[PDB]
């Protein structure tokens, strides 16, 4: 089997991408944030505290003839940005782009933190990291991909995120028309539960490539590119007037600037992030100061190849026995 679904930016900055997901019978379609940095499929629901729902579409398990409460199971998750959610668990039929999994754990939110409430466009998350990170207790549950992978034509999914435009998540096949030149694969460590890999270095604009190992995670659920402070300083030094602001929470730059590209290495291959992809717009409405798309990871504990990096590539998440990542230009 295969599936293919369009993923759409939630706003004009590509802050996140939503993908329609069919849950239950008859289908209830919710727009979920596909997150290769986490492993829970959770949704706003009829059980979510009413004051914490503000425009999201909800899953109502009582209206699904295939929903079954997973007795005794609870979940609770906290994300790197400080947001969180928790609740109970149903199993139900879940389909993405024509690919159907029966008995998928659908984690129904009883509580969500304010950042989720305040974003009416995201109805939940669909985790695509390794199932070892799933938070369901006392019986950990499998991700959608883990449940589907034995049925897929090939045990892979691909992320093809658009710049200020829709893109595609495919399951079970590699669309050879969706990229240019060849797919360069690299080794993954699953020891922390992430799609963790080592970039071979970077370049700023037309500058020389610096060969240096940068361990990080491929994370579709993170907006920006978080890299070591040395790398980030080297990038922003090429932008007149750019500085790190403790007040704002990162590097800012004149909105009048033309940003240089940023290149990262994948083995001997190179992925070029155009400068425009690094512009996240005014820090506040009407400000002439803009928020950078490359930021320091120093306070995180891990480097994160988020959407800024991934949307410059066609990315293969190879979930074979010995997992790997592939990157192609497009
Ligand atoms: C030969 C290899 C390399 O980079 O040395 N290469 C080009 C390549 O794509 O290797 C990807 C891979 C990593 C780990 C396990 C299986 C496959």
From Swiss-Prot:
Keyword Disulfide bond: yes
Reactions mediated catalytically: Hydrolysis of proteins with specificity similar to that of pepsin A, prefers hydrophobic residues at P1 and P1', but does not cleave 14-Ala-|-Leu-15 in the B chain of insulin or Z-Glu-Tyr. Clots milk
Domain Peptidase A1: 17-328
Disulfide pattern: 255-290
Record-listed E.C. numbers: 3.4.23.22
Superkingdom per UniProt: Eukaryota
GO MF, one example: aspartic-type endopeptidase activity
Disulfide bond among keywords: yes
Active site feature: 35, 199
A biological process term (GO) from this entry: proteolysis
Family: Belongs to the peptidase A1 family.
Protein name as annotated: Endothiapepsin
Species assigned in the record: Cryphonectria parasitica
Lineage: Eukaryota, Fungi, Dikarya, Ascomycota, Pezizomycotina
């Amino acid at each position: 089997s295969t599936g293919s679904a369009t993923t759409t930016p939630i706003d004009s900055l590509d802050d996140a991408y939503i993908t329609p997901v069919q849950i239950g019978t008859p289908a209830q379609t919710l727009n979920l944030d596909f997150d290769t940095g986490s492993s829970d499929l959770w949704v706003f629901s009829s059980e979510t505290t009413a004051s914490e729902v503000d425009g999201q579409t909800i899953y109502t398990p009582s209206k699904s003839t295939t929903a079954k409460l997973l007795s005794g199971a609870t979940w609770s998750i906290s994300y790197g940005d400080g947001s969180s959610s928790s609740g109970d668990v149903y199993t139900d039929t879940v389909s993405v782009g024509g690919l159907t999994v029966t008995g998928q754990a659908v984690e129904s939110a009883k509580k969500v933190s304010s950042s989720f409430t305040e974003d009416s466009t995201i109805d939940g998350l669909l985790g695509l990291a390794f199932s070892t990170l799933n938070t369901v207790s006392p019986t950990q549950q499998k991700t959608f991909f883990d449940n589907a992978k034995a049925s897929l034509d090939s045990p892979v999914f691909t992320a093809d995120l658009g710049y200020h435009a829709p893109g595609t998540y495919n399951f079970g096949f590699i669309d050879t028309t969706a990229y240019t030149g060849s797919i360069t694969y690299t080794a993954v460590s699953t020891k922390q539960g992430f799609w963790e890999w080592t970039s071979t270095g970077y370049a700023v604009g037309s500058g020389t490539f610096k060969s240096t190992s940068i361990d990080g995670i491929a994370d579709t659920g993170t907006t920006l590119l978080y890299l070591p402070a040395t790398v980030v300083s080297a990038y922003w030094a090429q932008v007149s007037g750019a500085k790190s602001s403790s007040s704002v929470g990162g590097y800012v730059f004149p909105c009048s600037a033309t940003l240089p590209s940023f290149t990262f290495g994948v083995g001997s291959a190179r992925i070029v992030i155009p400068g425009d992809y690094i512009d996240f717009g005014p820090i506040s409405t009407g400000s002439s100061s803009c928020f950078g798309g490359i930021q320091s990871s120093a306070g995180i504990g891990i480097n994160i190849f988020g959407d800024v990096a991934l949307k410059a590539a066609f990315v293969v998440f190879n979930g074979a026995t010995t997992p790997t990542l592939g990157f192609a230009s497009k």
